Copies of this chain bind each other. A is one copy, B any other.
Amino acid sequence: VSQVRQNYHSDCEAAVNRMLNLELYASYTYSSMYAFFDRDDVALHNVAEFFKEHSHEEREHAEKFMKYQNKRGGRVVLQDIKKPERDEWGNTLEAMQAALQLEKTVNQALLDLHKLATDKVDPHLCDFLESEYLEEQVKDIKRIGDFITNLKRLGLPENGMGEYLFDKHSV
């Protein structure tokens, strides 16, 4: 019943709230990876900063959905932000593989939201996803995949020297 609401389906409004939660979940997972690589017994500070940066960008992705919801006359509904799946992340390769999986999970949710927006004939929402989310996902997935290839090339997980070199030359 919002005075601004036009062509905005209840299903899309709800899916936007769920997507917001997933962005926050991703932010929290990256913050966990940051803290892990900052441990004195891990100590890969450029890797830590990479994940800290990713955490910040996910928070921005979430805020943009909040703003979107209000612009369309939907109502932001928040849920708990679940803690990350792991408390420790093994090493740079394990963490990067988890990040790849996470970005693909986020991407799948965005693609699913686009399918819903398409089904409900909401071109504004489709454009929003295409212009603000989908290409960012493809770029990040590619960058993380490239990193994984290099970490394998460097002999991870066994090759500690390789891991050191990655932190010094790749991030």
Which residues of A are in contact with B by a Cβ distance under 8 Å?
2-4, 6-7, 24, 28, 31-32, 34-36, 38-43, 45, 59, 63, 66-67, 69-73, 75-84, 87, 100, 104, 107-108, 111, 114-115, 118, 121, 123-124, 126-131, 134-135, 138-139, 141-142, 145-150, 152-155, 159-165, 168-169
Contact = CB atoms under 8 A, between A and B. Distances in A.
A119 to B, nearest CB: 11
A36 B67 CA distance: 10
Contacts of A169: 164, 168
The 6 closest A-B pairs by CB, nearest first: A153-B160, A43-B146, A127-B130, A81-B81, A40-B145, A4-B145
A80 B83 contact: yes
B127 A131 contact: yes
B40 A146 contact: yes
Contacts of A162: 160-161, 164
